[PDB]
Design a protein around this ligand. Structure first.
Ligand SMILES: NC(=O)c1ccc[n+]([C@@H]2O[C@H](COP(=O)([O-])OP(=O)(O)OC[C@H]3O[C@@H](n4cnc5c(N)ncnc54)[C@H](OP(=O)(O)O)[C@@H]3O)[C@@H](O)[C@H]2O)c1
Ligand code: SF4
Ligand code: SF4
Ligand code: FES
Ligand SMILES: [Zn+2]
Lengths: 77, 72, 328, 688, 184, 15, 101
């Protein structure tokens, strides 16, 4: 990605092979590649709008916006 | 339905409970088993000998695998 | 759906309020959001275009209390999503000078109307506090004032349960009269006196205007549809205000005169050339609205309501509220 | 100079003689037949135990308390070893150390390995005993033994993989509980503990079972995996659901209460807790009202401010009612609130205030007449019981357990009058009629003979009789029984009256009895702190009803103004219990929403209503309390009543020949807290 | 097993008027003395031509909030010539002006200032200058068992109202305290 | 004049 | 000023040890917590939220009383319940019921 090249674009397997931790090639670690679940890579955006960014369960920008009360009201009809 | 609703948020991919119910039982041969996976270390789940004297599967209390006795 | 105080004041105490502050990027916006978040309340600030203009008021509150959101104007969906979950809405938008792609009418009037209509849409609001000016009906020059009075009327009409504050001219750590005068004096030949030289005004301390805004915000069941003005602690002529600035800056006063012809003939070309294809400079001290509001005296109506009805008048415009001049 | 463990007041029944033994050197004095374990305790050294509890029988079963008593062969079980004069006890000798190491080795050998999921991990005896006394390495590889878990109702779930065969639960369930369901069955390593027909356990004190059972197998279901012990703080308070005022400890984290557990008090409840109370918090969290509310004329409720609420209530109070102002004191309320309410009403001028379950009839006031005279402790010294109109198993479960303890210790004939019920100790059923009570106050019903042939009898009248119309006749028949059977002697005053609330004692003490009978009918402005006023119904069509309460579930749909308050775990009040002993609770968790304490809300209401109260601080409130009834400021010591029952009867004809009605039903849906609470609801649905 | 020689010689030749307790452990040898003769004792050492200490390593305070003499001052000091170190440990209450040693060992002004503000123990002669470690005008003495871990007034943040300010504490996620104790 | 007790009572219940 | 309560924490109702009984300890009955709206952590504003039972452990009621009186805040001492020590017997376990009635 010649213009906007940024670190963390490397997938995990090649991240290992590149940081010298283990000289196992990305193709081998991808032969391993846990099945039955998994999430494709995604670089650390953190700046391209909050929705590409993320939030907790109480932050107003999160479409969830939980509520923390640890009780209930009486709430008559 | 409520626990995964408390912690998980996406509700697009299946929750852990859904996957561990998607895995079928094991149908072992004897009367007692031990659940770790396939290694003793590096996979945790200390030895959890569990009985199999009921007509229903028996969970493992770590990584519920639901072993079942095969014959009578 | 009455909110509940769930703390003991100070930061990290909830106290319920969630407020969307349109215009919370400049002077009164800074002060009012400071007051609100210090009291303890979530605040959503929109910024027209920047990445760092609201950045300062990002720190005046606990984590996730202040939230800067998105591009504000000229879109109903944007304003709606900004007011998605507010409890109160505070409007302060408004410049002091027209720019080709905008106009006093457009900005003040039409944006007040837009905010009123989108609040009607998101009719889950509790308090709409609109701050306009010490400006009356179209009975005065400076078309900003006419449009702002029409905006006052239309916001009262689209929201009979609203509160419209009419503060006098503000002086504070960053105002647009004292700092221009000090700049002008320090630069070259000293200050001018427009109109006559002895025109009367009621300057007011901005922290106290903000305290009045917080007071009227809380105001437990006492005034939910009111429209009134916020004067100052004492009557000041412009000459005496300039002399106050000079005594506080420790310099020699000098005044320029024959005000009306130079004022008009030197402030009129700006608007013409403006509406004629690229932005033009800012009106340092030759602002048309300055000329108008100085050729007509506007102090206090003494008729509707006041600080005295809300809370004690500002401390005094001698000791602390002018102490920021010592930078010179 | 060596204080016993925890402090332990030895008895010395015959203080003229007492043996002395050498514990680890220096000597100690000991009563006649005390065990080696208690001798070591007195000397001040704890010995590791699993199968020995100071309240259950002994059984040398765990085989971990081993010590060496010189002048004997090699091993000795400390418990069940009666001390001898001069035996040379020794606890820290290589023999004892190796004995403990080996026994712990065997336990941890055939134990499961699931501490990090097994709650009680961080509290476990077996864990701490191993870490402090056992070895550090295990030598074992082969397959262990595992059994299937078991269900015992929605209170005590068991993962029996770790039932180390102590029989603590068995001995408890057969001695203190009363119902024989649990039992140890099997043989050898294959030995389980479980009811053989997969039944449940329809008794209280099962929470006491889960406290007894040391290793984490029997555990409370509604506290499944919510927290370890090292995470949450404990505040020592009392109980308000029952009437005994049990001493408990509320374990809470943040603004949430996680559980409650008993704490030792060898005067009221030994170390136990009735099943109702241990699970009474979930709803205290669950349902709640946390805003002052006003009824909008469409029959709805709107949340208003305290200023407006107090203003409207004070306005209407002054407005209409000249002489028809009544106030019902709550079932779970404190003497502070009661005295404040009574003072506010009497300053308002119109006074009909009365407690929760106190009868509309005369209900004379003599402390010896309306408190349990013989302290619960002394109740272990009776020989003949005369329970009338009372099922103490359902009300005052701790007093029931005490009576069962007495009957177990020494067989004490017990005669019970009233409706049919399932007692758990060989009870005699004498009939259902105050007519029978008359006959026994007279010569028929030869059971009276037993009384005359009795040493230290006890006559227990349940407080449910306060609501019956003819109460002076019942109490006078009891007076005649006492006079003729010699049961009121100065050495021993065995004439007890139970109670069935926590606020009833303090109410009857301050004097909250209704001056009239048709008070609710004739009223027009009722001030409630508690519910039920007869089926919340006797109140007329037009009547200003103000419910100054908490956890609103019932009668709220009749209320006209609503004032939220602080529960019994969020305030500091004074509650008096049946033996006349006055305790005080302590705050544990923050108030919910914006509710306020009861005496505070009453004083504020008075001030805004004009006539104000001369006191505005808890100190002055308790000073007024000292002025009206002093023991309530003499908190934490029972002040007996040294005056007889010389009341004056007013019926003088008969006892109305009507049977004794049942006083409390379902044992769980009473107590509005539990009622609007929940685990009690499913316990009521299943365990009955 | 280290310095029995110096300790034994020092105890057997001292003026035994001003020694209240002696402990010849193997962790460290302790001369617990009276606060009235401390300067006298220390000036005996550093000068006697056998047990000359000549270097003061530490002056630390210890707090025991259950004894009538609340505090405990401790002087750890070695003898570079005789390869030995001793620990002279004195008692000290709330206000009780303790003697100074800045005349003998000039390396105590900073350690005595540190024990002035961390604890509250005074010091009669020179070294009791103003506080050192804690920042500025400070309410308590923040190392006894009463000054809580999070301080009384510690919120300190900027104010565009004026510039910056210090306000009472309202921290979030309160300090959790775990128990972990073990009744054997 | 509202007998400052009440002034506190209208605020939070921790005074 | 603050009202404090001096008590001795009773034995835990789960274990059977004794290394934590008879240890006088003062608590500041401080309960003013609330839920941090962002995450859900338990905030507070009392400086004495935990110190009383996190560092202040006293040796006896006399010492704790003198210390509270010294710092000035008013106190109210509580009572300490101790287990009564009866006498037990394995023979009493294996007692003998009487003859038939
Ligand atoms: N002269 C006075 O001091 C005075 C006296 C009495 C009353 N008032 C009133 O007080 C209020 C606040 O005054 P102020 O001194 O603080 O001025 P201000 O900070 O400049 O307030 C206007 C805000 O809206 C932004 N804005 C500018 N053009 C906009 C547009 N076309 N659409 C949307 N937003 C736009 C401004 O710049 P950014 O885009 O950078 O955010 C600023 O954030 C005004 O309503 C004014 O009439 C002022
Ligand atoms: S009860 Fe549970 S936590 Fe304790 S040692 Fe036994 S298995 Fe582990
Ligand atoms: S699980 Fe409980 S009842 Fe069973 S042997 Fe263990 S301690 Fe006893
Ligand atoms: S306690 Fe003595 S044998 Fe178990
Ligand atoms: Zn598993």
């Amino acid at each position: 990605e010649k213009s906007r090249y940024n670190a963390s674009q490397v997938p995990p397997e090649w991240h290992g092979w590149l940081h010298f931790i283990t000289d196992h090639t990305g193709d081998e670690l991808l032969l391993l590649k846990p099945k039955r679940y998994g999430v494709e890579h995604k670089e650390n955006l953190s700046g391209e709008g909050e929705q590409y960014i993320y939030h907790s369960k109480g932050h107003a920008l999160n479409p969830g916006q939980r509520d923390w009360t640890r009780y209930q009201p009486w709430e008559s009809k | 339905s409520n626990h995964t609703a408390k912690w998980m948020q996406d509700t697009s991919k299946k929750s852990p409970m859904e996957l561990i119910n998607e895995v079928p039982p094991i149908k072992v041969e004897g009367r007692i088993v031990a659940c770790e996976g396939d290694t003793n270390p590096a996979l945790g789940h200390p030895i959890e000998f569990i009985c199999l004297d009921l007509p229903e599967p028996a969970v493992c209390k770590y990584c519920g695998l639901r072993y079942v006795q095969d014959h009578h | 759906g009455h909110l509940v105080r769930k703390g003991t004041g100070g930061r990290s105490s909830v106290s319920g309020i969630i407020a969307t502050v349109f215009g919370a990027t400049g002077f009164l916006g800074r002060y009012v959001v400071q007051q609100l978040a210090k009291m303890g309340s979530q605040v959503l600030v929109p910024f027209r275009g920047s990445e760092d203009c609201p950045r300062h008021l990002k720190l005046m509150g606990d984590l996730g209390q202040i939230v800067p959101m998105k591009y504000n104007p000229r879109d109903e969906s944007s304003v709606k999503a900004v007011m998605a979950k507010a409890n109160v809405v505070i409007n302060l938008i408004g410049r002091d000078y027209e720019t080709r792609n905008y106009s006093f009418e457009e900005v003040h009037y039409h944006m007040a109307e837009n905010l009123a209509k989108i609040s009607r849409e998101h009719g889950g609001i509790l308090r709409f506090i609109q701050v306009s000016c010490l400006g009356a009906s179209p009975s005065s020059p400076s078309r900003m004032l006419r449009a702002k009075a029409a905006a006052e009327e239309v916001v009262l009409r689209e929201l009979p349960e609203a509160t419209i504050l009419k503060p006098a001219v503000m002086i504070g750590t960053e105002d647009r009269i004292l700092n221009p005068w000090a700049h002008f004096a320090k630069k070259y030949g000293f200050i001018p006196l427009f109109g006559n030289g002895s025109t009367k005004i009621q300057p007011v301390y901005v922290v106290d205007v903000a305290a009045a805004l917080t007071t009227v915000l809380k105001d437990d069941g006492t005034s939910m549809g009111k429209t009134y003005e916020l004067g100052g602690p004492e009557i000041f002529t412009v000459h005496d205000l300039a002399e106050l600035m000079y005594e506080t800056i420790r310099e020699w006063p000098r005044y320029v005169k024959v005000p009306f012809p130079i004022a008009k003939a030197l402030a009129t070309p700006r608007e013409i050339l403006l509406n004629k294809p690229f932005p033009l400079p800012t009106p340092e001290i030759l602002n048309l609205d300055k000329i108008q509001a100085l050729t007509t005296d506007t102090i206090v109506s003494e008729n509707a309501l006041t600080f005295n009805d809300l809370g004690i008048i500002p401390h005094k415009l001698k000791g602390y509220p002018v102490e920021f001049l010592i930078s010179y | 100079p060596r204080s016993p463990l925890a402090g332990a007041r030895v008895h010395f029944a015959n203080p003229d003689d007492a043996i002395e033994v050498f514990v680890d050197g220096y000597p100690v004095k000991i009563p006649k037949g005390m065990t080696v374990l208690q001798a070591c305790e007195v000397a001040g050294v704890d010995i590791p135990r699993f199968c020995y509890h100071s309240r259950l029988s002994i059984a040398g079963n765990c085989r971990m308390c081993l010590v060496e008593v010189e002048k004997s062969p090699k091993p000795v079980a400390s418990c069940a070893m009666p001390a001898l004069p001069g035996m040379k006890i020794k606890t820290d000798t290589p023999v004892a150390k190796k004995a403990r190491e080996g026994v712990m080795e065997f336990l941890l050998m055939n134990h499961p390995l699931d501490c990090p999921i097994c709650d009680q991990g961080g509290e476990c005896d077996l864990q701490d005993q191993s870490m402090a006394f056992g070895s550090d390495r295990g030598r074992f590889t082969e397959v262990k033994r595992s059994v299937v878990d078991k269900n015992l109702g929605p209170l005590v779930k068991t993962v029996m993989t770790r039932c180390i065969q102590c029989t603590r639960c068995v001995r408890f369930a057969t001695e203190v509980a009363g119902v024989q369901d649990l039992g140890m069955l099997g043989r050898g390593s294959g030995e389980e503990i479980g009811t053989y027909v997969e039944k449940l356990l329809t008794s209280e004190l099962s929470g006491n079972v889960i406290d007894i059972c040391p290793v984490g197998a029997l555990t409370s279901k509604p506290f499944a995996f919510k927290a370890r012990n090292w995470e949450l703080k404990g505040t020592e308070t009392i109980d308000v659901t029952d009437a005994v005022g049990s001493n408990i400890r509320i374990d809470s984290r943040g603004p949430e209460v996680m559980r409650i557990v008993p704490r030792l008090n060898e005067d009221i409840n030994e170390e136990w807790i009735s099943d109702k109370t241990r699970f009474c918090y979930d709803g205290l969290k669950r349902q709640r009202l946390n805003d002052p509310m006003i009824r909008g004329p469409d029959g709805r409720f709107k949340a208003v401010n305290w200023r407006d609420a107090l203003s409207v209530i004070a306005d209407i109070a002054h407005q209409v009612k000249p002489e028809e102002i009544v106030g019902v004191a709550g079932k779970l309320s404190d003497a502070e609130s009661m005295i404040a309410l009574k003072d506010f009403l009497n300053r308002m001028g119109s006074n009909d205030v009365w407690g929760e379950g106190i009868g509309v009839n005369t209900n004379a006031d003599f402390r010896s007449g309306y408190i349990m005279n013989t302290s619960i402790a002394g109740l272990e010294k009776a020989d003949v019981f005369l329970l009338v109109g009372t099922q103490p198993r359902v009300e005052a479960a701790m007093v029931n357990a005490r009576i069962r303890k007495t009957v177990r210790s020494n067989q004490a004939k017990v005669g019970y009058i009233g409706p049919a019920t399932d007692f758990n100790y060989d009870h005699k059923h004498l009939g259902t009629d105050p007519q029978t009570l008359v006959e026994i106050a007279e010569g028929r019903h030869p059971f009276f003979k037993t009384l005359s042939d009795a040493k230290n009898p006890v006559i227990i009248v349940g407080a449910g009789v306060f609501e019956r119309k003819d109460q002076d006749a019942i109490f006078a028949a009891v007076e005649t029984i006492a006079q003729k059977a010699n049961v009121v002697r100065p050495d021993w005053n065995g004439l007890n009256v139970l109670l069935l609330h926590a606020a009833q004692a303090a109410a009857l003490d301050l004097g909250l009895v209704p001056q009239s009978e048709k008070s609710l009918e004739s009223a027009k402005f009722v001030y409630l702190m508690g519910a039920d006023d007869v089926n919340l119904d006797k109140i007329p069509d037009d009547a200003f009803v103000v419910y100054q309460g908490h956890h609103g579930d019932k009668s709220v749909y009749r209320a006209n103004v609503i004032l939220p308050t602080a529960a019994f775990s969020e305030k500091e009040g004074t509650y008096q219990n049946t033996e006349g002993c006055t305790q005080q609770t302590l705050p544990a968790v923050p108030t919910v929403g914006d509710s306020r304490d009861d005496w505070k809300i009453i004083r504020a209401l008075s001030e805004v209503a004009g006539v104000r109260l001369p006191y505005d601080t808890i100190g002055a409130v308790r000073a007024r309390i000292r002025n009206v009834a002093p023991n309530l400021v003499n908190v934490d010591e029972r002040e007996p009543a040294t005056l007889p029952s010389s009341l004056r009867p007013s019926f003088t004809q008969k006892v109305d020949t009507t049977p004794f009605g049942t006083v409390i039903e379902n044992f769980y849906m009473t107590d509005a807290i539990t009622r609007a609470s929940k685990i009690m609801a499913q316990c009521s649905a299943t365990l009955l | 097993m280290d310095n029995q020689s110096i300790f034994k010689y020092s105890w057997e030749t001292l003026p035994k008027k001003w020694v209240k307790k002696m402990e010849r452990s193997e962790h460290g040898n302790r001369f617990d003395t009276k606060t009235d003769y401390l300067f006298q004792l220390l000036c005996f050492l550093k000068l006697h031509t056998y047990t000359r200490v000549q270097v003061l390593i530490d002056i630390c305070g210890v707090d025991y909030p259950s004894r009538k003499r609340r505090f405990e001052v401790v002087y750890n000091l070695l003898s570079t010539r005789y390869n030995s170190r001793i620990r002279v440990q004195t008692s000290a209450d709330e206000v009780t002006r303790i003697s100074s040693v800045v005349s003998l060992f000039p390396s105590a002004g900073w350690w005595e200032r540190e024990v002035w503000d961390m604890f509250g123990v005074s010091s009669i002669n020179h070294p009791d200058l103003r506080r050192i470690l804690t920042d500025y005008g400070f309410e308590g003495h923040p190392l006894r068992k009463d000054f809580p871990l999070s301080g009384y007034v510690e919120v300190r943040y900027d104010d565009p109202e004026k510039r910056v300010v210090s306000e009472p504490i309202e921290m979030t996620q309160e300090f959790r305290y775990f128990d972990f104790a073990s009744p054997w | 004049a509202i007998s400052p007790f009440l002034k506190n009572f209208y605020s939070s219940n921790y005074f | 000023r603050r009202r404090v309560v001096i008590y001795s924490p009773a034995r835990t109702a789960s274990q059977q040890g004794s290394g934590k009984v008879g240890r006088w300890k003062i608590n500041f009955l401080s309960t003013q917590k609330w839920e941090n709206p962002l995450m859900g952590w338990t905030s507070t504003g009392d400086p004495y939220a935990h110190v009383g039972d996190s560092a202040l452990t006293f040796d006896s009621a006399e010492a704790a009383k003198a210390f509270a009186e010294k710092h000035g805040w008013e106190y109210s001492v509580k009572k300490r319940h101790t287990p009564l020590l009866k006498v037990k017997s394995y023979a009493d376990n294996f007692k003998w019921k009487g003859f038939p009635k």
